[PDB]
Amino acid sequence: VNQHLCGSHLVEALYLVCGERGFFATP
Amino acid sequence: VNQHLCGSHLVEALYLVCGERGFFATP
Amino acid sequence: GIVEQCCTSICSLYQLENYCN
Amino acid sequence: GIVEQCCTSICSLYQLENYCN
Numbered sequence: 001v002n003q004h005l006c007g008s009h010l011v012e013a014l015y016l017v018c019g020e021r022g023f024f025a026t027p
Numbered sequence: 028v029n030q031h032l033c034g035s036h037l038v039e040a041l042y043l044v045c046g047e048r049g050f051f052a053t054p
Numbered sequence: 055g056i057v058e059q060c061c062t063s064i065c066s067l068y069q070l071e072n073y074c075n
Numbered sequence: 076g077i078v079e080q081c082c083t084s085i086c087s088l089y090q091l092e093n094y095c096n
């Protein structure tokens with residue numbers, strides 16, 4: 001399995017981990 | 028003069044500063 | 055992260071460049 | 076930044092959380 005987090009996967013990982021939270025650059 | 032960089036203005040600031048380096052979350 | 059440093063607070067060019075790549 | 080740490084290389088949960096907010 002690929003353990004790199006790029007593009008959409010990286011966005012997906014931040015959604016998961018950051019929660020309420022938020023992160024750049026979600027609207 | 029607002030010195031805060033939020034949302035789309037922060038994305039622009041990164042386009043300007045990062046140039047060819049790129050940055051998350053632009054392609 | 056960058057929102058706290060550059061949006062909530064004011065950040066420098068050096069800090070901003072931290073968030074490239 | 077987050078791309079070199081998490082995309083080019085492999086990053087931990089702690090590193091990834093540094094890029095929230």
Ligand code: NA
Binds near residue numbers: 055073076
């Ligand atoms: Na970032």
